[PDB]
Every structure is written in C-alpha cells, then in structure tokens.
Ligand SMILES: *[C@@](O)(CO)[C@H](C[C@@H]1CCNC1=O)NC(=O)[C@H](CC(C)C)NC(=O)c1cc2c(OC)cccc2[nH]1
C-alpha cells in the first residue's frame with residue numbers, strides 16, 4: 001500500500017522538556033547542556049502585542065526559568081537569545097541526545113512533527129514546508145516549542161520549532177537558529193500568508209507511487225514538452241517543473257517505465273478534466289505532500 | 302482540520318528486536334524477558350507453502366534462535382508456541398519495557414503501526430482495523446513482526462503483529478496472543494478477504510467532529526431506533542452499530558447535545574438522499590474514531 005508515514009519519534013521524545021517563565025509554559029528541546037525554546041515564553045499576555053524582546057530578556061535572570069524533564073528540575077546556569085528562540089544553558093547534559101544537525105528546510109520538502117504539550121510528546125505526523133512558507137499542521141494550545149525533524153542513519157536533522165497558528169488554520173514557525181520561515185513575526189497579531197501554490201514535483205511523485213501500487217486509470221497515450229506542461233501548471237497555481245526536478249524523478253520513471261513528460265501529460269489532463277468522482281491512492285484530490293524521496297523510501301526501502 | 306496522527310513511537314522502538322532462524326529473519330517484540338514473534342520465522346521459503354508448525358518446532362532448539370537488539374545477541378533460554386506466535390524466553394529483562402497490556406481490538410478501531418525492518422524501526426503511521434479484518438498498511442519484505450499499538454497515560458496497549466500481505470495489497474496479522482484478525486492463516490497462499498463495509502461508528506464520529514467545528518447543516522428534526530438504522534445502513538454497505546458503539550459515542554453526544562440516535566437519523570438521511578460538503582468534502586471519512594476526534598478537537 002501507500003500511506004503518509006512519519007519517522008519514528010523516539011530520538012526526539014528523549015529531548016522534550018517543559019519551560020516555564022512566570023505563568024507561561026511551553027515546550028523546549030534539550031540537546032547536550034542547552035534547552036532551545038520560543039522566546040515568547042518570557043512574555044506576559046500584555047507584552048505579546050508588541051514585545052521588545054531584548055528589553056524583556058535583560059530584565060530576566062537564570063532563576064526566572066523553570067525547566068523540567070519529566071518530574072526532574074534542570075537548573076538554568078545561562079541564557080541568551082537566538083533570534084526568535086532562547087538558548088538556556090543547564091547544569092546537566094542530556095544523555096539521550098542523539099547525533100543531530102540543524103537544517104533550514106526548503107519549500108516542498110517534508111518532515112515529521114512531534115506535537116508536544118507541557119513537555120510531553122502527544123502525536124507524530126508528516127508535514128511539508130509549503131511554497132508560501134507555512135505548514136499545514138495540527139497544533140493546539142500549549143504546542144509551542146514542538147519540533148519538526150527528519151532522520152538519516154541515526155542522525156536527527158531538526159528543521160522546525162513551532163510558534164504560531166494563523167487565522168486560516170495553517171502554522172508558522174522557525175528553524176533551530178530561530179529564523180522564521182516566511183514573513184511571520186512572533187507578536188500576538190492576526191497574520192496572513194502569501195498565496196500558496198501546489199508542489200508539482202510532489203504531485204508527480206505521488207502519481208508514480210499510485211502507478212507502483214496498481215492505480216493507472218489517469219494515464220494516457222499523450223506527451224507534452226516541459227514548457228507546455230509548465231504553462232498549464234502555472235495557469236492552475238502549480239509550481240513550474242525544472243530540469244533538475246525532471247532528473248529527481250529519474251529513478252521513479254525508470255522503475256515504472258513511464259517517461260517524466262508522459263506523467264506530466266497525465267497530470268495536465270487531470271488538471272484540465274478533473275478526477276470526475278474517481279480516486280487515486282484512495283484520495284479525491286491531488287496530493288502534494290509526498291516527495292520523490294518519500295515515495296522511493298516507502299516503495300523500495 | 303483533521304489528519305491521521307500516530308502515537309509517539311519511542312516506547313515501542315525500545316522493544317523492537319530482530320529474530321532469525323537460518324536465513325529467515327523478521328521482527329520481534331521484547332517485553333521483560335520474553336520476545337514475541339511470528340511463528341513462521343522457523344520456516345525456509347519452501348516450508349511456508351504448507352507448514353506443519355508443531356512438527357517444525359519439534360526440531361528447533363533454544364540454540365536455533367538468533368535474537369538481536371541491534372547487533373547485541375540476547376540468548377534464548379526457553380520457547381513455546383501460542384497460536385501463530387512464538388514466545389521466546391531470553392536471559393535479559395528489557396530495561397526499556399514500558400507499562401503495557403495486550404488487547405484485541407475491534408473492527409473500526411484505530412492504532413499506530415511502527416513499521417520495522419531487521420529489528421530497526423523505519424516509520425510510523427495510523428491504521429484502522431477494517432470491518433473485513435484487514436488493515437490498509439504500508440509494508441515491504443522483512444516487515445513481519447512489526448506491531449500496532451495505542452498509548453493511554455504512558456501505558457502501551459499492543460493490538461497487532463504483522464504477518465501477511467493479501468493479493469489485493471491490504472494486510473493481515475494477529476493480536477499479541479497470536480490469534481489472527483479475520484479468517485486468515487499463516488501459510489504462503491493467496492487468501493481473500495470478505496467484501497469491506499464502511500465503519501458507521503467513525504462516520505458518526507466525523508459528523509460530531511463537523512458539528513463541533515460549526516458545520517451542522519445535515520442535522521434534522523427526527524430520530525430513529527437503533528434497529529431501523531441498522532437495517533437501512535446495511536443496504537448502503539455500512540456496518541450495523543452495536544451497544545458498545547453507542548456507548549463509545551457518549552462523550553461526543555454529551556459535548557454537542559446531539560443524541561446518538563438523532564445523529565443516526567441525520568446519517569440515514571445522508572445515505573438515502575445523498576449530499577454540499579462536510580469538513581469540507583463530499584466524501585464521509587470513516588478512519589477517525591470517536592477517541593481520535595476528541596484527541597484532535599479537545600487535546
Ligand atoms: C503557542 O503554544 C504559545 O506558546 C501557540 C500555539 C498556537 C495556539 C493554538 N494553536 C497553535 O498553533 N502560539 C501562539 O499562541 C502565538 C504566540 C505568539 C508567537 C506570541 N500566537 C498565535 O498563534 C496567534 C495570535 C493571533 C491573533 O492575535 C490577535 C489573532 C489571530 C490569530 C492568532 N494566532
């Protein structure tokens with residue numbers, strides 16, 4: 001079969017802690033002797049409308065922060081601001097720290113989210129970095145500080161820390177350097193994102209995954225040039241496909257025997273005609289949150 | 302919006318091992334000093350076509366089993382078969398054993414699956430046990446012995462151990478007592494599942510989830526008996542509701558003030574007259590249980 005699959009979250013669960021400053025509590029990520037968390041933990045409800053973060057942070061001391069790993073309190077021995085995050089130095093190192101890296105994910109790429117509440121892991125799901133730099137996640141009150149990550153041979157690449165839910169229900173956050181993805185700001189305001197687009201490379205990978213798993217009703221005897229495909233794709237708010245993206249689909253094309261441009265012609269027909277009550281891999285819409293890597297990993301190992 | 306979400310898998314990852322007999326390898330579950338795994342690990346590829354498990358197990362000794370946590374071997378000191386599983390006693394009690402229970406889930410219930418290969422966890426996803434006793438999973442060669450589970454208050458309830466991929470691409474397995482879900486058997490044969498039906502309980506949970514989010518156009522001024530609903534639902538390939546299903550809907554019914562039977566009358570009208578959108582599609586979702594809805598609406 002074919003399902004949306006997240007990385008096993010164990011390596012990340014062992015890093016989640018709770019951070020409290022006054023009456024504000026959120027999640028933190030404890031790696032070696034540092035705890036990372038969103039900086040708005042230092043704000044009161046009144047500060048959040050227009051916070052002068054450097055001004056608010058200089059008024060805090062080490063004992064202002066209560067850090068808890070389960071029932072155990074970790075003593076904060078230093079603090080510094082890391083863009084929209086705080087870096088809290090603690091007096092003990094996390095023995096459960098995996099091999100890790102901090103990466104800045106690009107639009108179209110996917111990652112797993114470990115949703116946490118009060119320092120306790122609660123759920124794990126897969127998300128994609130949207131072209132408009134939001135993520136379509138599922139986060140409730142207390143989820144700030146939850147992280148997004150990928151795993152490669154026991155190394156955890158952390159790429160996202162959660163901060164905000166927009167009025168439309170989509171989400172905004174930062175990388176682990178504290179830099180927001182997109183034009184968002186950590187202030188208590190209603191913020192709109194730019195117009196989103198469909199991740200074309202991922203839709204094509206998902207159509208290849210459908211062929212690999214028996215679904216091929218949408219295929220046709222036609223072909224298209226890359227430019228003619230891109231003209232139709234842009235008309236429907238889909239990202240243009242570059243020659244680099246065609247090359248990425250090489251392995252999936254060689255596996256199914258379907259040329260990349262032949263799959264583009266099938267997608268062009270789907271965009272123009274529609275699905276007309278039919279389904280692809282159980283879905284009634286074109287799915288764009290599976291990368292070619294996600295498809296290859298799930299079908300081949 | 303709603304999405305499939307799995308439980309954090311760490312407590313289960315700490316229990317995954319690999320079990321090998323000859324060149325046949327699969328996954329096992331290590332809890333305290335016992336390792337549970339599919340009994341077909343004792344078969345060569347040719348033995349699987351028509352195996353006599355009792356006879357095949359007589360010639361296996363404790364020294365025949367290679368159990369590994371990573372590349373660390375755990376010595377087997379006892380073995381027994383329990384239905385379609387093997388229970389191997391090992392010389393080491395797993396320090397990472399969470400608080401746990403073994404449960405046999407009912408059709409319609411959801412659970413997380415930790416797909417494993419060679420004892421190494423690879424991915425996690427949420428599955429629903431279909432009324433035909435299959436799951437629409439994603440499994441490759443080497444996935445046998447992967448487990449399904451739910452976590453409630455740091456207690457892991459194990460409910461599924463993977464054994465087979467049917468010719469239609471759906472999957473079959475057993476509970477942690479080795480009893481298959483459905484009429485399947487552990488042999489290398491093409492087996493067919495019965496025709497599947499829609500999980501009525503979960504469609505009702507999805508309607509309550511829509512009401513919780515302010516989408517309530519489909520509610521009507523009538524009610525139905527459970528029997529009248531069951532008779533109409535079966536004409537639409539929907540499962541009949543049981544007293545347990547009505548009980549499970551208790552919290553959602555109290556939260557919205559919609560009696561379960563009043564919601565069945567709304568669903569009955571949707572079935573007989575069609576659909577407009579709900580949350581906000583024309584297709585009703587049947588893989589989110591009443592617990593899944595509460596978990597994503599209330600937190
Ligand atoms: C964090 O848990 C707070 O620590 C929280 C997570 C969201 C709550 C619900 N779902 C979530 O994803 N984030 C916030 O509450 C942030 C805090 C900022 C960065 C200081 N704020 C918002 O997400 C936010 C504020 C407003 C708003 O105002 C006025 C109006 C409309 C939307 C909105 N979202």
Ligand SMILES: *[C@@](O)(CO)[C@H](C[C@@H]1CCNC1=O)NC(=O)[C@H](CC(C)C)NC(=O)c1cc2c(OC)cccc2[nH]1
Nearest residue numbers: 440441442443444445464465466468487488489490491
């Ligand atoms: C286990 O990993 C074996 O240890 C394996 C898992 C499947 C392989 C691929 N995807 C999976 O989910 N299970 C099997 O290979 C089982 C072994 C049995 C229980 C002894 N066999 C099947 O799943 C199986 C056999 C046949 C078949 O024959 C002939 C014909 C059609 C389908 C089919 N499935």
